[PDB]
Amino acid sequence: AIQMTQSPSSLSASVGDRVTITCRASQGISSDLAWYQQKPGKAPKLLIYDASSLQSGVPSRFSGSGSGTDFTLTISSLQPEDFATYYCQQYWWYPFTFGQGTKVEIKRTVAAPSVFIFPPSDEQLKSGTASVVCLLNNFYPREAKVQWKVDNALQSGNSQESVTEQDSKDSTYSLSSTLTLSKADYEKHKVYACEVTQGTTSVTKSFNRGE
Amino acid sequence: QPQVRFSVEQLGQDGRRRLTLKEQPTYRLQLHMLSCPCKAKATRTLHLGKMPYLSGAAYNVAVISSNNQTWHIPADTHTEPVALNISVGTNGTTMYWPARAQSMTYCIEWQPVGLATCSLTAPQDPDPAGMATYSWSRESGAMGQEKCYYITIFASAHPEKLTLWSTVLSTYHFGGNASAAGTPHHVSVKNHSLDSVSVDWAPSLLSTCPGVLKEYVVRCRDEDSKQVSEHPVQPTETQVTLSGLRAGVAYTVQVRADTAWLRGVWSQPQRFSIE
Amino acid sequence: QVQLVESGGGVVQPGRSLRLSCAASGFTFTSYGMSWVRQAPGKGLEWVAGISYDASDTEYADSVKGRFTISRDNSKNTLYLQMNSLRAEDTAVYYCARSPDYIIDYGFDYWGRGTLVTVSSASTKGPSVFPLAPSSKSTSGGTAALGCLVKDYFPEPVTVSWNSGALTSGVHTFPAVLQSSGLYSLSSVVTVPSSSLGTQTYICNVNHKPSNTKVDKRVEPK
Ligand SMILES: *[C@@H]1O[C@H](CO)[C@@H](O)[C@H](O)[C@H]1NC(C)=O
Ligand SMILES: *[C@@H]1O[C@H](CO)[C@@H](O)[C@H](O)[C@H]1NC(C)=O
Ligand SMILES: *[C@@H]1O[C@H](CO)[C@@H](O)[C@H](O)[C@H]1NC(C)=O
Ligand SMILES: *[C@@H]1O[C@H](CO)[C@@H](O)[C@H](O)[C@H]1NC(C)=O
Ligand SMILES: [Cl-]
Ligand SMILES: [Cl-]
């Protein structure tokens, strides 16, 4: 199968910027290449076919070029509704293959997260498990290290993370980290701490079981 | 170079035909549509294994190697027995042809039989009569010369995609002032019996253009009662017998040649009476 | 208007079979090729299979070759995908897509809404909803956070609202995570003024249609 590699995987830009996405093919595919735009929870929309033919109804700020193995998608002046993920797809030969995608996010100034920690409810402890939740609210950029500590013991393997999409109003992200313990392990320790690192700043929010 | 040989279907009811491929001894296929030269996209490079549905247009297909055998695909059109309403006049030329689905782009191509003109229409829907249309200014001289023209019309819902063209129809049309140019010559009246005459004429110039000539009409005028009678004649016949004539009465005979859409100009009148 | 509506999705156990259907309307179904495209959660698009207009040509991706079968019923304007020996990796949203030509070629100009197909030996189960309570003594200045932990449901998805939709400012509902037990979990949080914790009631509304379970949890400070 023909491999389709896009570059970059993600990028941040501002309204008015000129955005260029590249797509490279493991074999020559002449001009049998398409470009799609997909927004979260929606089907893709075809933007460009034949490497450079603009699909009907697509604004003229979109344009494609290239032939053989190297192709480029260009947005001359980025608009608010253009922030999304973009895929290339070859239809030169079967099986048809897509690129891994390129997410175009909106750039803003740095923002430190507001950090909150939640002990497990008494209602959940009955079930014999304990979920400890750490909330990172309204921060930018997306990169952030979260580290759980139980009586200062560094935790690993027992947590999972989840990130929202960029907020429509302030373009920040929010993150949640859930530490899962057994009721027996949870009742064995006192101090539960969530440490968040961003740049030169580490912030730790903690609680004491039973207070 | 791979010893692959092509095959093509006959033109189907959709105006399409599949170009297929078979190997009997990397490589790619280059496809060039020759007909309708005024289109923006004329060539496409394809993988050998995918076998497109071409139109009845003429194509150049070649297998190109990546480290060339070429076939000139003959045209294979669909001919309409019904002539199109093509009107050439003082202010321009207008066409009507059977349309298909909506938002269709048509390419009209013509050449005098025995100057290759090309025209590309904007997307258009069928009219209430199921017809598409296009018109040219007088300056264009669109089929303005009194000659027999061969016309081919193509259709595509995506004219930028080369492998999506379909054949609509091919037809013949006599350009210029066909009504005047079609007038029969050498009209003659001959004594056939004591009460009848034979009328003969040379074949109309329209008869040389396939499907254009609908019929002849012979008009006989009784110069005493002023009564008029018209006799239609098959286009394969250039003779008719007029009977029931009265002695001493003067008669006038004229012949015209009609198309499916135009009344022809009458020939010079022939005066005669029973001997 | 051109429309493509998928159906047949749902839960299927590993090794079992499932049959997807696409109902086409608004165009001449017999004149266009059709394809299936799937998208795993949080992943990119993956072309599954394609079929020509007269069903003479069929093509498949490598990962589904020999296990999937695409077919069409041109008299009923229906596209089919027969999935056999389903694995967990086949869990994705499956889209119905139209090709512009007789043959399998060019891009996809028309898509369906998509249907979720979850391959897992887990059983359908409504979620447990636990409070993420704010303290009654503010420790974050004038801003307080609270929320709901929606734990151990199957399959996707759940929808979360606050105060019957009356509360949307500051609401963050995170995407679900697949836990090692095979069940899903997510949280929904809201930031609110700390002075309003005593006077105002906050209720998260969790709805899980696959199990016909609706849960309303009042979140009170602790
Ligand atoms: C043929 O087309 C011409 C030009 O539009 C029009 O004037 C004429 O009425 C048409 N004839 C018929 C019989 O529709
Ligand atoms: C053709 O010529 C005749 C005169 O010979 C004229 O009456 C008629 O209007 C002309 N027709 C056209 C379409 O020019
Ligand atoms: C041509 O245009 C003139 C006006 O310049 C108009 O009077 C005449 O009717 C038109 N005739 C045709 C056949 O278009
Ligand atoms: C033909 O000639 C004969 C002999 O002259 C005559 O009797 C007859 O009336 C003529 N017929 C016509 C139609 O003039
Ligand atoms: Cl279309
Ligand atoms: Cl007259």
Side-chain half-sphere exposure of A105, counting CA atoms within 13 A: 19
Q: Are A138 and A108 in contact (CB under 8 A)?
A: no
The domain spans of chain C are: 3-119, 128-219
Select from B9, B29, B47, B50 the residue whose CB has the most chain C CBs within 10 Å, as the one to mutate to test that interface: B50
Nearest CA in chain C to A97: C47
Q: Scanning the structure block, which residue is given the tokens 């539960």?
A: A192
Q: Which of A28, A50, A93 sits opposite B66 (nearest CB)?
A: A28
d(CA C34, CA C15): 26
Say yes or no: B184 contacts chain C, CB-CB below 8 A.
no
d(CA C198, CA C191): 15
CATH of C3-119, one of 3.65.10.10, 3.40.50.1820, 1.10.357.10, 2.60.40.10: 2.60.40.10
d(CA C214, CA C222): 25
Task: Give residues after which chain C gaps, C-N over 2.5 angstroms.
Answer: none
Peptide bond connecting A120 to the previous residue in cis, omega within 30 degrees of 0: no
- Chain C residues within 8 A of B53 when measuring between CB atoms: 101-103
In sequence order, the β-bridge partners of residue A116 are A135
Whether residue B52 sits in one domain with residue B98: no
Q: Do domains C3-119 and C128-219 have the same CATH topology?
A: yes
- Chain B residues within 8 A of A93 when measuring between CB atoms: 47, 49-50
Q: Scanning the structure block, which residue is given the tokens 């609202």?
A: C161
Q: Please indicate whether residue B133, judged by its CB atom, sits closer than 6 Å to ligand 1.
A: no
Q: Are B148 and B208 in contact (CB under 8 A)?
A: yes
Query: Whose C-alpha lies nearest to ligand 3, atom 2?
Result: B91
Q: Scanning the structure block, which residue is given the tokens 């509304």?
A: C205
Domains identified in chain A and CATH numbers: 4-106 (2.60.40.10), 114-208 (2.60.40.10)
A 10 A CB-CB count for B47 gives 18
Containing structural domain, residue B184: 180-273
In sequence order, the β-bridge partners of residue C70 are C81
A18: exposed, middle or buried (Cβ count in 10 Å: 0-12, 13-18, 19+): exposed
Specify the resolution in Å: 2.6
Nearest CA in chain C to B53: C102
Q: Please indicate whether residue B197, judged by its CB atom, sits closer than 6 Å to ligand 4.
A: yes
Whether residue B187 sits in one domain with residue B146: no
Whether residue B238 sits in one domain with residue B154: no
Q: Which of C28, C101, C104 sits opposite B163 (nearest CB)?
A: C101
Task: Give me the amino acid identity at A51.
Answer: A
Alpha-carbon gap: C160 to the closest alpha carbon of chain A (Å): 14
Among B151, B178, B205, give the residue marking a domain's end: B178
Whether residue B115 sits in one domain with residue B57: no
Among B73, B103, B122, give the residue marking a domain's end: B73
Q: What is the DSSP letter of B181?
A: H
Q: Scanning the structure block, which residue is given the tokens 């980290």?
A: A177
Distance (angstroms) between ligand 2 centre and the Cα of B180 equals: 6
Residue B233 within any structural domain of the chain: yes
Which phi and psi (to 5°) does residue A196 adopt?
A: -115, 130
Tokens representing residue A182 in the block: 């057994």
Q: Scanning the structure block, which residue is given the tokens 């959940």?
A: A124
Atom of ligand 2 nearest to the CA of B89: 13
Q: Which residues line ligand 3 (CB under 6 A)?
A: B 89-91
For chain A, the maximum distance between any two Cα atoms, rounded to a whole number of angstroms, is: 68
Q: What is the DSSP letter of C215?
A: E
Q: Are C127 and C151 in contact (CB under 8 A)?
A: yes
C52: exposed, middle or buried (Cβ count in 10 Å: 0-12, 13-18, 19+): buried
d(CA C106, CA C24): 19
H or E element that contains A124: helix A122-126
Class of domain C128-219: mainly beta
Find the radius of gyration of the CA atoms of chain C.
22
> SS3 for C29?
helix
Distance (angstroms) between ligand 5 centre and the Cα of B100 equals: 13
Select from B54, B104, B158, B166 the residue whose CB has the most chain C CBs within 10 Å, as the one to mutate to test that interface: B158
Distance (angstroms) between ligand 3 centre and the Cα of B88 equals: 12
Nearest of A122, A105, A119, A109 to residue A164 by alpha carbon: A105
Q: Is the dihedral of CA B2, B5, B11, B17 positive or negative?
A: negative
Q: Can you state the percent helix, strand and coil of chain A, rounding each to 5?
A: 5, 50, 40
Q: Please indicate whether residue B191, judged by its CB atom, sits closer than 6 Å to ligand 4.
A: yes
- The strand pair at C115-119 and C10-12 is best described as parallel
Task: Give me the amino acid identity at B197.
Answer: V
User: What CATH number did the domain enclosing B157 receive?
Assistant: 2.60.40
Nearest of B96, B253, B86, B111 to residue B177 by alpha carbon: B86
Whether residue B188 sits in one domain with residue B164: no
Whether residue B267 sits in one domain with residue B190: yes
Task: Give me the amino acid identity at C139.
Answer: T
Select from A50, A54, A67, A90 the residue whose CB has the most chain B CBs within 10 Å, as the one to mutate to test that interface: A50
Domain count, chain B: 3
Which residue of B85, B134, B179 sits with most ligand 1 atoms within 8 Å of its CB, as the best mutation to test the pocket?
B85
Query: Whose C-alpha lies nearest to ligand 3, atom 10?
Result: B91
A 10 A CB-CB count for C21 gives 17
Sheet arrangement for strand A129-139: A114-118, A129-139, A173-182, A159-163
H or E element that contains A183: helix A183-187
d(CA B152, CA B35): 9
Residue B80 within any structural domain of the chain: no
Say yes or no: A121 contacts chain C, CB-CB below 8 A.
yes
Residue B78 within any structural domain of the chain: no
> SS3 for B81?
coil
Nearest of B271, B266, B267 to residue B252 by alpha carbon: B271
- Chain B residues within 8 A of C103 when measuring between CB atoms: 50-53
Beta carbons of B28 and A30 less than 8 Å apart: yes
Tokens representing residue C91 in the block: 């869990």
Whether residue B172 sits in one domain with residue B94: yes
